[PDB]
């Protein structure tokens, strides 16, 4: 219950101004009552409000230069007094001066030589969803947000440093990026480029990283400020000759492609969470770049890894179906004559000329697990375990269960060396999601991907949400069937002889898979005949409602936004096999420079056609 | 990896201008540095760039007449020097002159009497999807594309030949057709008609074929430049009397209908691949023309061929169900008591008075195959075998399996003369797609067609795309069921006694047909009870997702574009039974001329109503 303290103190603002007749005249334009306040006696200049205010704080906050200049002969040092703490740590009147777009107080508090080096790093000033705004803390950082032109010109003419950085290391240029009024603040980008003039030996400010290592170029990408990205792009592209309707411009491509792990661009559009950012893939240098990364040595060296993979599964299944598999030897099946099993999975029979063939069929698989184990000993070391789930679901949640493939297929070889009876429990799991993970490769072969994308987005958000609701409407009828047939002999009509199978038999009855029980040779008890019917009108309702649960997402799908999610998925493939596959088979994308007056920067061009 | 060489040489353009101070001044407006370049010494006039450039090439390409005229006293012969090779084979400054819409250099390089006979047949200039533009190679061919009026007037006043043809034989008039800015280039059609004046004895240019035999009338049709087609149509139609709101105009109809195999119009809208072309059927002379070809002696002589066809199938099925069919005579069924068969298909029993009736019931069918064999001995000779598949899917993919009907129904008579045991393997196939091909005739009977059209577009693009995805999610569970019931006796619960039926029994379980395997008399092994359930929540997912896989196409369907695909399908019928059925029963469409001051051209009229 944190946010209550915001408001408790904010009414305490209205408390302290209420008791104070000086601050009562700081509310409105009571300059003639300010004449009644300062010339008649010595009131102290430190009349602190709820979080430590003075008059020109309150006066400029309630839009009053007329109350602001009359304290100047009263107290010139109160410009040097910031607001105290805990929400507004270091806030001065200069900062709220530009909040109200002007009052000409900006020259007037600069007539008391106010300091732009004041940093208001308080609670409400850092980036958080509990604060509905974000501004940085330097005053010129605020003036970029408010889109007030000559105000920015005014303070740089009085000693403003543009290269100053926030609590996170973001300069003022980052702060212009994170404004939700995007094109309306775009015009102040090049204005703040216009005061770069002294070229520092480290940066001309547009390559400045923050303490999360983001130059504000790609910070616009990882936030997805799309229209600002283009205006930022146009200075960086190097256009060559134009040929009538077409133009052979030439894009920069320095930080865009993967280079030596400097947190390159493409992995950051993947690993972010804000889904408006993925529309940066619809921008002119980027969509065609990933196309050539996907057309040439994209899918055919991807699907080649797919091609060996189902062969790995085929050589798994043949060494899965041929099993030790002896006849029934220890005992006859005594209990109940229900133990309908005879096979018992042999201890140490391998020397036959069939069992050598399965052995080379075997150990290729368990070593093949250890290959995809060694994929993850750096990769679990890379992005943790618990937030690795936070890496999964957005792009490749098929990646995680190929590892639970490996846990089971390793433990079943541990199982065969011990030869315990519980052998099928891995071998069930180790077979089914082996095949179920070949649909991860459906993205590579064309036109087959997007349903498998839509497979993903229906199961993890809708069907498991449905399976919450479905797993309780069963348990009524299932247990209601279970008690209603405790009365009856399970010799005939034996679906419900005990409670654990009574759930399962109801469950498969729920999907209308089983015939619907009914002897028709004896009588059935009376409430069976309606409750099963009372299950039926539910069975025709909610799975039919589940059929249309699909549709309310599907109108939000393909007509609008699965097609982007397909190619958003294709690049989550792209940087990841770029990373995991080492060099000397991938040549990195685009043309290299260094032979053409360009140097170490590699480039990429495209044609077009205008009007 | 071909397209890399485009860019490697295109940076080499920027390499050669970089080393050359003459070409450095050819970049921008360095005429005072051109004073520093030519008057002071004799620099050679052949300073070749990457693919062989000179200065006025580079100057006019970077929009500089001011650099262009200063080399004229330096080198007047460099107009006669084309760009060298391998991309731009024969490109001169005259060609790039009209690319930049003007510079008044067009008169100025004609002051050195430049040649419009220059043909730039280089790599980037022919029609290809690797080139984003298409222009032809004569300079007047370029000026039609750029839509620059008096520029076209200027060069014809200096010796331009309009009748010149490209590498493919297309003249300049074809080049105006293939511009993607369609109405914006439409105004230059009649302008280039306006300089026809000398009537040549062969053509007045608007009947010129190319080396694929396309007069640029129907070339607009086969590409589907719809709005240009109408403006091209209006001069060709011959309007008669107007009666207030109605007008009895009279359309030309020379090349539109099928005539003596001169690659007529209607078959070309069918056999093309670009699906924007089929909207030429929505144009005023064409839609009503095919209507009268379909209303009168269209369907009733089509459905008549349908009417004999199911009678052929009925007289096939009666000679399919009555079979030789002897009792069990060679041996008792010894193995396993599973060989539940007794019939063995008699060798040479035909003389009974029932078996003569099936014999006349027989040989009508195998001869009836040979009729639809003789349809194809010219037709396989017509359009090949492998690209005949490229004829199938767009219109009548039902046509191909009536031929695999014929292969099987021929081989089963080969089979009865040998009387091998494998008799049902054709007879299964020869029966099922015999009936399944009567739905080809669903297009003829009204309102029944479009679902059978939608049958086609769901199976060959979506369900076989689904059956990729579905055939792997089965094999997990199916083999997982197969290993989990290797343990168990297949006497009771015998769905999965071996692997080949284990797939099929899972497959029909997947569509929730089979009952779902459960004895309820014995115990079942433990991972059966969840993995079958783990099959169930997939079984309620993806075939339910397949249900809505239909819908994302269906919103792209009937609300917008199946109704055109229906009548696009009806004319693919129309020219084909026009072709395959010979004369003396079809009278060719429209009214004949030759009695009415019109001659050999046959015509067709229509009424209307305007505002
Ligand atoms: N095979 C290793 C799994 O890695 B996958 C993956 C790796 C990093 C981030 C997200 C997913 C994956 C890659 C392509 C397709 C499916 C999954
Ligand atoms: N019966 C011969 C098959 O020819 B069909 C056909 C012929 C040429 C091109 C495409 C298809 C066909 C014609 C009408 C309906 C269905 C198929
Ligand atoms: Ca049943």
UniProtKB/Swiss-Prot annotation, chains A, B:
Glycan attachment sites: 331
Catalytic activity: Ca(2+)(in) = Ca(2+)(out)
Effect of residue 361 to R: In HRPTTN; decreased localization at the plasma membrane; loss of calcium ion import across plasma membrane
Bilayer-crossing regions: 301-321, 359-381, 397-416, 423-442, 463-485, 530-550
GO biological process, one term: calcium ion homeostasis
Its membrane topology: Multi-pass membrane protein
Cytoplasmic side: 1-300, 382-396, 443-462
Effect of substituting residue 358 to Q: In HRPTTN; decreased localization at the plasma membrane; loss of calcium ion import across plasma membrane
GO CC, any one term: plasma membrane
Keywords for this protein: ANK repeat, Calcium, Calcium channel, Calcium transport, Calmodulin-binding, Cell membrane, Disease variant, Glycoprotein, Ion channel, Ion transport, Membrane, Metal-binding, Phosphoprotein, Repeat, Transmembrane, Transmembrane helix, Transport
Region entry Interaction with calmodulin, spans: 66-76
Main location: membrane
Subcellular location: Cell membrane
Motif (Selectivity filter): 514-518
Top-level taxon: Eukaryota
UniProt GO MF annotations: calcium channel activity; calmodulin binding; identical protein binding; metal ion binding
Binding residues annotated for Ca(2+), in chain numbering: 515
Modified residues annotated as Phosphotyrosine in this record: 134
Ranges facing Extracellular side: 322-358, 417-422, 486-498, 519-529
Known tissue expression: Expressed at high levels in the gastrointestinal tract, including esophagus, stomach, duodenum, jejunum, ileum and colon, and in pancreas, placenta, prostate and salivary gland. Expressed at moderate levels in liver, kidney and testis. Expressed in trophoblasts of placenta villus trees (at protein level). Expressed in locally advanced prostate cancer, metastatic and androgen-insensitive prostatic lesions but not detected in healthy prostate tissue and benign prostatic hyperplasia.
Binding partners and assembly: Homotetramer. Probably also forms heterotetramers with TRPV5. Interacts with TRPV5. Interacts with S100A10 and probably with the ANAX2-S100A10 heterotetramer. The interaction with S100A10 is required for the trafficking to the plasma membrane. Interacts with BSPRY. Interacts with TCAF1 and TCAF2 isoform 2. Interacts with calmodulin.
Implicated disorder: Hyperparathyroidism, transient neonatal: An autosomal recessive disease characterized by impaired transplacental maternal-fetal transport of calcium, high serum PTH levels and signs of metabolic bone disease in the neonatal period. Skeletal anomalies include generalized osteopenia, narrow chest, short ribs with multiple healing fractures, and bowing or fractures of long bones. Affected individuals experience postnatal respiratory and feeding difficulties. The condition improves within a short time after birth once calcium is provided orally.
Stated role: Calcium selective cation channel that mediates Ca(2+) uptake in various tissues, including the intestine. Important for normal Ca(2+) ion homeostasis in the body, including bone and skin. The channel is activated by low internal calcium level, probably including intracellular calcium store depletion, and the current exhibits an inward rectification. Inactivation includes both a rapid Ca(2+)-dependent and a slower Ca(2+)-calmodulin-dependent mechanism; the latter may be regulated by phosphorylation. In vitro, is slowly inhibited by Mg(2+) in a voltage-independent manner.
Similarity field: Belongs to the transient receptor (TC 1.A.4) family. TrpV subfamily. TRPV6 sub-subfamily.
Name of the protein this chain belongs to: Transient receptor potential cation channel subfamily V member 6
Species per Swiss-Prot/TrEMBL record: Homo sapiens (Human)
